[PDB]
Amino acid sequence: SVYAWNRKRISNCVADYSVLYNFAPFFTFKCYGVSPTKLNDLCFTNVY
Amino acid sequence: YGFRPTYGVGHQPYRVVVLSFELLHAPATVCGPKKSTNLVKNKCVNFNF
Amino acid sequence: ADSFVIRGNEVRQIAPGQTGNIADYNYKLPDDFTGCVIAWNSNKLDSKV
Numbered sequence: 001s002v003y004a005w006n007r008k009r010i011s012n013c014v015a016d017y018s019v020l021y022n023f024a025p026f027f028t029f030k031c032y033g034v035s036p037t038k039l040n041d042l043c044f045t046n047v048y
Numbered sequence: 049y050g051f052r053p054t055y056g057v058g059h060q061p062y063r064v065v066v067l068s069f070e071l072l073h074a075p076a077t078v079c080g081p082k083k084s085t086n087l088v089k090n091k092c093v094n095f096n097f
Numbered sequence: 098a099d100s101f102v103i104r105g106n107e108v109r110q111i112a113p114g115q116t117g118n119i120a121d122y123n124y125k126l127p128d129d130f131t132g133c134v135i136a137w138n139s140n141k142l143d144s145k146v
């Protein structure tokens with residue numbers, strides 16, 4: 001629900017952001033920050 | 049790819065045509081609509097070459 | 098004019114900055130580029146059985 005969201009922790013794993021377009025297509029991706037194609041370039045301490 | 053005309057919306061195809069223009073270079077071939085005007089040679093104008 | 102078919106997820110990824118499965122392995126648009134692209138829906142006319 002929009003008032004009680006789940007804050008899932010993603011850590012200690014290799015994240016391949018290329019294979020994302022199959023799970024749920026027709027997105028926006030609205031990247032306020034790191035570029036759409038630049039996730040698979042740098043490390044992230046915590047992803048939520 | 050390939051599917052029946054109803055599918056999971058995101059795979060629905062798109063027809064993309066580009067138009068890569070280019071300038072400078074040779075004398076022009078594409079010009080668009082013409083409103084060409086005769087020439088003067090000794091006075092100031094608002095030219096369009 | 099270059100025309101092709103590409104489904105629904107790289108219409109805004111055809112920009113010069115964005116890269117991936119299409120810009121590296123298909124129609125690649127250079128880093129600097131003047132021109133405009135045109136795309137329309139193909140929900141039933143280019144979907145077939």
Ligand SMILES: *[C@@H]1O[C@H](CO)[C@@H](O)[C@H](O)[C@H]1NC(C)=O
Pocket residue numbers: 022023024
């Ligand atoms: C979601 O899980 C179901 C099985 O419960 C599977 O058939 C489907 O392909 C999955 N969708 C994905 C991975 O996008």
